[PDB]
PDB file of C-alpha atoms in Angstrom:
ATOM      1  CA  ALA W   1      13.820 -63.840 173.786  1.00  0.00           C
ATOM      2  CA  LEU W   2      12.604 -63.572 170.270  1.00  0.00           C
ATOM      3  CA  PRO W   3      12.233 -66.711 168.330  1.00  0.00           C
ATOM      4  CA  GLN W   4      15.009 -68.229 166.432  1.00  0.00           C
ATOM      5  CA  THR W   5      12.550 -68.248 163.367  1.00  0.00           C
ATOM      6  CA  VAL W   6       9.491 -66.644 163.860  1.00  0.00           C
ATOM      7  CA  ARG W   7       6.994 -69.042 162.236  1.00  0.00           C
ATOM      8  CA  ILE W   8       3.883 -66.677 160.732  1.00  0.00           C
ATOM      9  CA  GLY W   9       0.636 -68.420 159.768  1.00  0.00           C
ATOM     10  CA  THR W  10      -1.580 -66.912 156.823  1.00  0.00           C
ATOM     11  CA  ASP W  11      -4.305 -68.426 154.691  1.00  0.00           C
ATOM     12  CA  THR W  12      -3.298 -68.108 150.973  1.00  0.00           C
ATOM     13  CA  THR W  13      -6.802 -67.724 149.941  1.00  0.00           C
ATOM     14  CA  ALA W  14      -6.959 -64.047 150.505  1.00  0.00           C
ATOM     15  CA  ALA W  15      -5.403 -61.937 147.291  1.00  0.00           C
ATOM     16  CA  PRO W  16      -3.908 -59.079 147.282  1.00  0.00           C
ATOM     17  CA  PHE W  17      -3.023 -59.639 150.850  1.00  0.00           C
ATOM     18  CA  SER W  18      -1.986 -63.532 150.786  1.00  0.00           C
ATOM     19  CA  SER W  19      -1.672 -65.846 148.060  1.00  0.00           C
ATOM     20  CA  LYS W  20       0.628 -67.824 145.995  1.00  0.00           C
ATOM     21  CA  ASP W  21       2.405 -66.939 142.787  1.00  0.00           C
ATOM     22  CA  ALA W  22       3.117 -69.366 139.989  1.00  0.00           C
ATOM     23  CA  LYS W  23       6.430 -70.086 141.495  1.00  0.00           C
ATOM     24  CA  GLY W  24       4.603 -71.359 144.714  1.00  0.00           C
ATOM     25  CA  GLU W  25       6.010 -68.076 146.678  1.00  0.00           C
ATOM     26  CA  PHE W  26       3.571 -66.226 149.022  1.00  0.00           C
ATOM     27  CA  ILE W  27       2.778 -62.949 147.565  1.00  0.00           C
ATOM     28  CA  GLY W  28       0.798 -59.717 148.635  1.00  0.00           C
ATOM     29  CA  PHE W  29       0.733 -56.953 150.609  1.00  0.00           C
ATOM     30  CA  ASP W  30       0.457 -58.971 153.892  1.00  0.00           C
ATOM     31  CA  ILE W  31       3.530 -60.733 152.806  1.00  0.00           C
ATOM     32  CA  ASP W  32       5.193 -57.696 151.844  1.00  0.00           C
ATOM     33  CA  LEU W  33       4.406 -56.180 155.046  1.00  0.00           C
ATOM     34  CA  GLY W  34       5.499 -59.372 157.051  1.00  0.00           C
ATOM     35  CA  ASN W  35       8.713 -59.741 155.170  1.00  0.00           C
ATOM     36  CA  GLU W  36       9.684 -55.752 155.419  1.00  0.00           C
ATOM     37  CA  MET W  37       9.085 -55.751 159.135  1.00  0.00           C
ATOM     38  CA  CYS W  38      10.984 -59.020 159.860  1.00  0.00           C
ATOM     39  CA  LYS W  39      13.854 -57.575 157.894  1.00  0.00           C
ATOM     40  CA  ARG W  40      13.859 -54.422 160.097  1.00  0.00           C
ATOM     41  CA  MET W  41      13.594 -56.816 163.063  1.00  0.00           C
ATOM     42  CA  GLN W  42      16.590 -58.725 162.088  1.00  0.00           C
ATOM     43  CA  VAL W  43      14.741 -62.002 162.483  1.00  0.00           C
ATOM     44  CA  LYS W  44      14.197 -64.969 160.656  1.00  0.00           C
ATOM     45  CA  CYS W  45      10.408 -65.239 159.295  1.00  0.00           C
ATOM     46  CA  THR W  46       8.783 -68.537 157.787  1.00  0.00           C
ATOM     47  CA  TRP W  47       5.695 -68.387 156.200  1.00  0.00           C
ATOM     48  CA  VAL W  48       3.203 -71.249 156.998  1.00  0.00           C
ATOM     49  CA  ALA W  49       0.251 -71.692 154.986  1.00  0.00           C
ATOM     50  CA  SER W  50      -2.965 -72.484 157.178  1.00  0.00           C
ATOM     51  CA  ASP W  51      -6.603 -72.382 156.776  1.00  0.00           C
ATOM     52  CA  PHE W  52      -8.062 -68.932 158.227  1.00  0.00           C
ATOM     53  CA  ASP W  53      -9.723 -70.776 161.224  1.00  0.00           C
ATOM     54  CA  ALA W  54      -6.712 -72.820 162.265  1.00  0.00           C
ATOM     55  CA  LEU W  55      -4.473 -69.504 162.538  1.00  0.00           C
ATOM     56  CA  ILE W  56      -5.731 -68.461 166.278  1.00  0.00           C
ATOM     57  CA  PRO W  57      -5.946 -72.236 167.506  1.00  0.00           C
ATOM     58  CA  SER W  58      -2.077 -72.921 166.045  1.00  0.00           C
ATOM     59  CA  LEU W  59      -0.831 -69.683 167.548  1.00  0.00           C
ATOM     60  CA  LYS W  60      -2.243 -70.431 171.109  1.00  0.00           C
ATOM     61  CA  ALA W  61      -1.048 -74.127 170.684  1.00  0.00           C
ATOM     62  CA  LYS W  62       2.647 -72.387 169.873  1.00  0.00           C
ATOM     63  CA  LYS W  63       2.828 -74.018 166.204  1.00  0.00           C
ATOM     64  CA  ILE W  64       3.590 -70.552 164.906  1.00  0.00           C
ATOM     65  CA  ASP W  65       4.636 -67.467 166.557  1.00  0.00           C
ATOM     66  CA  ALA W  66       2.529 -64.967 164.797  1.00  0.00           C
ATOM     67  CA  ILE W  67      -0.716 -64.435 162.058  1.00  0.00           C
ATOM     68  CA  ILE W  68      -0.541 -62.049 159.182  1.00  0.00           C
ATOM     69  CA  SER W  69      -3.724 -63.231 157.266  1.00  0.00           C
ATOM     70  CA  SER W  70      -5.857 -59.929 157.449  1.00  0.00           C
ATOM     71  CA  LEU W  71      -6.874 -60.532 161.052  1.00  0.00           C
ATOM     72  CA  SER W  72      -9.075 -58.008 162.102  1.00  0.00           C
ATOM     73  CA  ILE W  73      -8.387 -56.231 165.725  1.00  0.00           C
ATOM     74  CA  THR W  74     -11.505 -56.946 167.476  1.00  0.00           C
ATOM     75  CA  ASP W  75     -12.142 -57.087 171.241  1.00  0.00           C
ATOM     76  CA  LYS W  76     -13.320 -60.512 171.379  1.00  0.00           C
ATOM     77  CA  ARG W  77     -10.056 -61.430 169.659  1.00  0.00           C
ATOM     78  CA  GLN W  78      -8.288 -58.829 172.141  1.00  0.00           C
ATOM     79  CA  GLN W  79      -9.760 -61.045 175.110  1.00  0.00           C
ATOM     80  CA  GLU W  80      -7.444 -63.969 174.133  1.00  0.00           C
ATOM     81  CA  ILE W  81      -4.514 -62.728 171.881  1.00  0.00           C
ATOM     82  CA  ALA W  82      -2.620 -59.659 171.358  1.00  0.00           C
ATOM     83  CA  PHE W  83      -2.088 -57.253 168.159  1.00  0.00           C
ATOM     84  CA  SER W  84       0.603 -55.304 166.834  1.00  0.00           C
ATOM     85  CA  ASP W  85      -0.545 -51.709 165.798  1.00  0.00           C
ATOM     86  CA  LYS W  86      -2.604 -51.620 162.676  1.00  0.00           C
ATOM     87  CA  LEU W  87      -1.481 -53.075 159.438  1.00  0.00           C
ATOM     88  CA  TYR W  88      -4.323 -51.399 157.447  1.00  0.00           C
ATOM     89  CA  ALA W  89      -8.001 -50.872 157.502  1.00  0.00           C
ATOM     90  CA  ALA W  90     -10.612 -53.471 156.855  1.00  0.00           C
ATOM     91  CA  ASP W  91     -13.906 -51.362 157.008  1.00  0.00           C
ATOM     92  CA  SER W  92     -17.117 -51.925 154.955  1.00  0.00           C
ATOM     93  CA  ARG W  93     -18.740 -49.675 152.323  1.00  0.00           C
ATOM     94  CA  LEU W  94     -22.088 -48.921 150.452  1.00  0.00           C
ATOM     95  CA  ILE W  95     -21.975 -49.766 146.621  1.00  0.00           C
ATOM     96  CA  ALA W  96     -24.435 -48.038 144.247  1.00  0.00           C
ATOM     97  CA  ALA W  97     -24.861 -46.741 140.810  1.00  0.00           C
ATOM     98  CA  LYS W  98     -22.393 -44.236 139.907  1.00  0.00           C
ATOM     99  CA  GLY W  99     -23.668 -40.573 140.713  1.00  0.00           C
ATOM    100  CA  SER W 100     -25.814 -42.225 143.412  1.00  0.00           C
ATOM    101  CA  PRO W 101     -26.464 -39.331 146.287  1.00  0.00           C
ATOM    102  CA  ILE W 102     -26.513 -42.339 148.937  1.00  0.00           C
ATOM    103  CA  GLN W 103     -24.698 -41.789 151.977  1.00  0.00           C
ATOM    104  CA  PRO W 104     -23.832 -44.412 154.913  1.00  0.00           C
ATOM    105  CA  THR W 105     -26.245 -43.020 157.038  1.00  0.00           C
ATOM    106  CA  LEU W 106     -29.666 -43.886 158.597  1.00  0.00           C
ATOM    107  CA  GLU W 107     -31.251 -40.350 157.261  1.00  0.00           C
ATOM    108  CA  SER W 108     -29.809 -41.091 153.645  1.00  0.00           C
ATOM    109  CA  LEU W 109     -30.666 -44.888 153.502  1.00  0.00           C
ATOM    110  CA  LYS W 110     -34.529 -44.637 155.157  1.00  0.00           C
ATOM    111  CA  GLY W 111     -36.555 -45.670 152.320  1.00  0.00           C
ATOM    112  CA  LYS W 112     -33.671 -47.374 150.389  1.00  0.00           C
ATOM    113  CA  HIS W 113     -33.392 -51.043 149.693  1.00  0.00           C
ATOM    114  CA  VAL W 114     -30.245 -52.314 150.996  1.00  0.00           C
ATOM    115  CA  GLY W 115     -28.721 -56.028 150.632  1.00  0.00           C
ATOM    116  CA  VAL W 116     -26.089 -57.664 152.459  1.00  0.00           C
ATOM    117  CA  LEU W 117     -24.537 -61.459 152.764  1.00  0.00           C
ATOM    118  CA  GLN W 118     -26.476 -63.180 155.186  1.00  0.00           C
ATOM    119  CA  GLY W 119     -24.145 -64.394 158.138  1.00  0.00           C
ATOM    120  CA  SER W 120     -21.447 -61.642 157.406  1.00  0.00           C
ATOM    121  CA  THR W 121     -20.277 -58.531 159.747  1.00  0.00           C
ATOM    122  CA  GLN W 122     -21.654 -56.215 156.886  1.00  0.00           C
ATOM    123  CA  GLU W 123     -25.328 -57.983 157.936  1.00  0.00           C
ATOM    124  CA  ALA W 124     -24.383 -57.351 161.756  1.00  0.00           C
ATOM    125  CA  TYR W 125     -23.375 -53.558 161.393  1.00  0.00           C
ATOM    126  CA  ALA W 126     -26.653 -52.973 158.966  1.00  0.00           C
ATOM    127  CA  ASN W 127     -28.863 -54.817 161.629  1.00  0.00           C
ATOM    128  CA  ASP W 128     -27.792 -52.644 164.275  1.00  0.00           C
ATOM    129  CA  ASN W 129     -27.771 -49.277 162.587  1.00  0.00           C
ATOM    130  CA  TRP W 130     -30.219 -49.766 159.773  1.00  0.00           C
ATOM    131  CA  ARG W 131     -32.297 -52.918 159.694  1.00  0.00           C
ATOM    132  CA  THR W 132     -33.882 -52.271 163.308  1.00  0.00           C
ATOM    133  CA  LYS W 133     -33.941 -48.494 162.843  1.00  0.00           C
ATOM    134  CA  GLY W 134     -36.402 -48.972 159.860  1.00  0.00           C
ATOM    135  CA  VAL W 135     -34.012 -49.481 156.975  1.00  0.00           C
ATOM    136  CA  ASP W 136     -34.931 -52.250 154.383  1.00  0.00           C
ATOM    137  CA  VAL W 137     -32.220 -54.592 154.653  1.00  0.00           C
ATOM    138  CA  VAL W 138     -32.330 -57.997 152.899  1.00  0.00           C
ATOM    139  CA  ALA W 139     -30.058 -60.519 153.645  1.00  0.00           C
ATOM    140  CA  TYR W 140     -28.604 -62.601 150.798  1.00  0.00           C
ATOM    141  CA  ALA W 141     -27.346 -66.415 150.685  1.00  0.00           C
ATOM    142  CA  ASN W 142     -25.085 -65.820 147.810  1.00  0.00           C
ATOM    143  CA  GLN W 143     -22.973 -62.894 146.777  1.00  0.00           C
ATOM    144  CA  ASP W 144     -23.649 -63.147 143.212  1.00  0.00           C
ATOM    145  CA  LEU W 145     -27.516 -62.492 143.572  1.00  0.00           C
ATOM    146  CA  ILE W 146     -26.563 -59.588 145.514  1.00  0.00           C
ATOM    147  CA  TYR W 147     -24.781 -57.835 142.759  1.00  0.00           C
ATOM    148  CA  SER W 148     -27.281 -58.903 140.216  1.00  0.00           C
ATOM    149  CA  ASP W 149     -29.975 -57.279 141.963  1.00  0.00           C
ATOM    150  CA  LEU W 150     -28.258 -54.239 142.369  1.00  0.00           C
ATOM    151  CA  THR W 151     -27.236 -54.013 138.542  1.00  0.00           C
ATOM    152  CA  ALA W 152     -31.034 -54.987 138.165  1.00  0.00           C
ATOM    153  CA  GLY W 153     -32.244 -52.147 140.217  1.00  0.00           C
ATOM    154  CA  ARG W 154     -33.908 -54.332 142.883  1.00  0.00           C
ATOM    155  CA  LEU W 155     -31.520 -53.053 145.325  1.00  0.00           C
ATOM    156  CA  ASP W 156     -30.378 -49.302 145.589  1.00  0.00           C
ATOM    157  CA  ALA W 157     -26.932 -50.413 147.517  1.00  0.00           C
ATOM    158  CA  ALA W 158     -25.062 -53.090 148.767  1.00  0.00           C
ATOM    159  CA  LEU W 159     -22.795 -53.159 152.246  1.00  0.00           C
ATOM    160  CA  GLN W 160     -19.718 -54.983 151.316  1.00  0.00           C
ATOM    161  CA  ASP W 161     -15.988 -55.175 152.586  1.00  0.00           C
ATOM    162  CA  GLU W 162     -14.289 -52.250 150.862  1.00  0.00           C
ATOM    163  CA  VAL W 163     -11.011 -54.035 149.401  1.00  0.00           C
ATOM    164  CA  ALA W 164     -12.929 -57.168 148.479  1.00  0.00           C
ATOM    165  CA  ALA W 165     -15.521 -55.020 146.590  1.00  0.00           C
ATOM    166  CA  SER W 166     -12.751 -52.661 145.078  1.00  0.00           C
ATOM    167  CA  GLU W 167     -10.991 -55.559 143.688  1.00  0.00           C
ATOM    168  CA  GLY W 168     -13.931 -57.713 142.705  1.00  0.00           C
ATOM    169  CA  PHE W 169     -17.430 -56.353 141.395  1.00  0.00           C
ATOM    170  CA  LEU W 170     -15.906 -52.591 140.774  1.00  0.00           C
ATOM    171  CA  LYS W 171     -13.033 -53.870 138.635  1.00  0.00           C
ATOM    172  CA  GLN W 172     -15.421 -55.987 136.903  1.00  0.00           C
ATOM    173  CA  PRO W 173     -17.486 -55.214 133.756  1.00  0.00           C
ATOM    174  CA  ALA W 174     -20.726 -55.698 135.405  1.00  0.00           C
ATOM    175  CA  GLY W 175     -19.423 -52.699 138.022  1.00  0.00           C
ATOM    176  CA  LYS W 176     -18.269 -50.618 135.295  1.00  0.00           C
ATOM    177  CA  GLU W 177     -20.868 -48.035 136.232  1.00  0.00           C
ATOM    178  CA  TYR W 178     -21.138 -48.665 139.990  1.00  0.00           C
ATOM    179  CA  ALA W 179     -18.925 -46.607 142.928  1.00  0.00           C
ATOM    180  CA  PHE W 180     -18.689 -46.606 146.380  1.00  0.00           C
ATOM    181  CA  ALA W 181     -21.723 -44.231 147.940  1.00  0.00           C
ATOM    182  CA  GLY W 182     -20.163 -42.188 150.936  1.00  0.00           C
ATOM    183  CA  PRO W 183     -16.882 -43.087 152.961  1.00  0.00           C
ATOM    184  CA  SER W 184     -15.831 -46.468 154.643  1.00  0.00           C
ATOM    185  CA  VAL W 185     -18.109 -47.209 157.798  1.00  0.00           C
ATOM    186  CA  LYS W 186     -15.957 -48.032 160.680  1.00  0.00           C
ATOM    187  CA  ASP W 187     -16.584 -49.861 163.592  1.00  0.00           C
ATOM    188  CA  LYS W 188     -14.459 -51.652 165.950  1.00  0.00           C
ATOM    189  CA  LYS W 189     -17.292 -54.332 167.304  1.00  0.00           C
ATOM    190  CA  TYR W 190     -17.906 -55.713 163.697  1.00  0.00           C
ATOM    191  CA  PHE W 191     -14.910 -54.565 161.601  1.00  0.00           C
ATOM    192  CA  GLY W 192     -12.113 -54.459 164.030  1.00  0.00           C
ATOM    193  CA  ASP W 193      -9.765 -51.667 164.367  1.00  0.00           C
ATOM    194  CA  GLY W 194      -8.108 -52.565 161.337  1.00  0.00           C
ATOM    195  CA  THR W 195      -5.925 -55.664 160.791  1.00  0.00           C
ATOM    196  CA  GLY W 196      -2.858 -56.512 162.727  1.00  0.00           C
ATOM    197  CA  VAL W 197      -0.223 -59.355 163.095  1.00  0.00           C
ATOM    198  CA  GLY W 198      -1.838 -61.667 165.938  1.00  0.00           C
ATOM    199  CA  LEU W 199       0.179 -62.687 168.574  1.00  0.00           C
ATOM    200  CA  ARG W 200       0.522 -64.340 172.131  1.00  0.00           C
ATOM    201  CA  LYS W 201      -0.303 -61.915 174.870  1.00  0.00           C
ATOM    202  CA  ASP W 202       2.613 -63.082 176.758  1.00  0.00           C
ATOM    203  CA  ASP W 203       5.136 -62.199 174.001  1.00  0.00           C
ATOM    204  CA  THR W 204       5.657 -58.879 174.620  1.00  0.00           C
ATOM    205  CA  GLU W 205       9.131 -58.475 173.091  1.00  0.00           C
ATOM    206  CA  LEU W 206       7.887 -59.901 169.647  1.00  0.00           C
ATOM    207  CA  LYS W 207       5.016 -57.113 169.831  1.00  0.00           C
ATOM    208  CA  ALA W 208       7.178 -54.384 170.412  1.00  0.00           C
ATOM    209  CA  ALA W 209       9.943 -55.580 167.745  1.00  0.00           C
ATOM    210  CA  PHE W 210       6.824 -55.808 165.283  1.00  0.00           C
ATOM    211  CA  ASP W 211       5.545 -52.739 166.393  1.00  0.00           C
ATOM    212  CA  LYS W 212       8.782 -50.696 166.213  1.00  0.00           C
ATOM    213  CA  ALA W 213       9.410 -52.090 162.624  1.00  0.00           C
ATOM    214  CA  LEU W 214       6.134 -51.271 161.348  1.00  0.00           C
ATOM    215  CA  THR W 215       6.406 -47.419 162.453  1.00  0.00           C
ATOM    216  CA  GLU W 216       9.892 -47.105 160.913  1.00  0.00           C
ATOM    217  CA  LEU W 217       8.568 -48.567 157.452  1.00  0.00           C
ATOM    218  CA  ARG W 218       5.677 -46.163 157.825  1.00  0.00           C
ATOM    219  CA  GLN W 219       7.671 -43.214 158.520  1.00  0.00           C
ATOM    220  CA  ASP W 220      10.399 -43.679 155.690  1.00  0.00           C
ATOM    221  CA  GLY W 221       7.675 -44.087 153.320  1.00  0.00           C
ATOM    222  CA  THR W 222       8.320 -47.813 152.438  1.00  0.00           C
ATOM    223  CA  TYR W 223       4.905 -48.793 153.544  1.00  0.00           C
ATOM    224  CA  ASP W 224       3.172 -46.291 150.948  1.00  0.00           C
ATOM    225  CA  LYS W 225       5.342 -47.408 148.279  1.00  0.00           C
ATOM    226  CA  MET W 226       4.960 -51.113 149.194  1.00  0.00           C
ATOM    227  CA  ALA W 227       0.740 -50.426 149.165  1.00  0.00           C
ATOM    228  CA  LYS W 228       1.003 -48.354 145.682  1.00  0.00           C
ATOM    229  CA  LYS W 229       1.629 -52.108 144.125  1.00  0.00           C
ATOM    230  CA  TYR W 230      -1.924 -53.321 144.768  1.00  0.00           C
ATOM    231  CA  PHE W 231      -4.072 -50.014 145.764  1.00  0.00           C
ATOM    232  CA  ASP W 232      -4.865 -46.783 144.218  1.00  0.00           C
ATOM    233  CA  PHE W 233      -6.427 -45.489 147.650  1.00  0.00           C
ATOM    234  CA  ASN W 234      -5.538 -45.084 151.364  1.00  0.00           C
ATOM    235  CA  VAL W 235      -5.416 -48.495 152.427  1.00  0.00           C
ATOM    236  CA  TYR W 236      -4.301 -47.680 155.767  1.00  0.00           C
ATOM    237  CA  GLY W 237      -7.176 -45.562 156.711  1.00  0.00           C
ATOM    238  CA  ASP W 238      -7.013 -43.284 159.539  1.00  0.00           C
TER     239      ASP W 238
END
């Protein structure tokens, strides 16, 4: 049977997906999707704040019943847990000066100076596709110096998480004359097949319930209306 109340863990340091507001309520697109799905499932849902690295251990231990915390659908996680259908994309994307002809391709980037945060999935993507194929990819300890070097002209482009970059640098003053160069880069290995509700593999009824609500709230326009509160682009992706 479904839980009497579904405990959903989430990391509230992740605006505009999951944070706390001035009255201590959970807010964001993850919260909006979770709340809207639980409603269509006709099940009680309780949000549970947790560090991100605790979420999958708490789920396996049955301390919670789902995870909605921008949890990327990767094959390695798919070895230990289940996911609903995709909630939205979590892909990466190049940033460069406005007007840059740069594309996220070997052919475009060869000879260009590309920065990535050391230890990130962006660095990993950049290593296999670009660094090892002869692109000058430089890893950085701190994101602040990536952007500083970009605006200084020391880099030509930075590979960043799309939404993080869209909400951070590109809305800050220093990013005013910067834009995404080309489209997002998609790769399940490194960025997952979007994010989804994390669930225990044995909880097949719960997965079906989330997937069903999610399809209905997408088809009747609710997904698009809720996403418009935070994003001026196709956050769902393909």
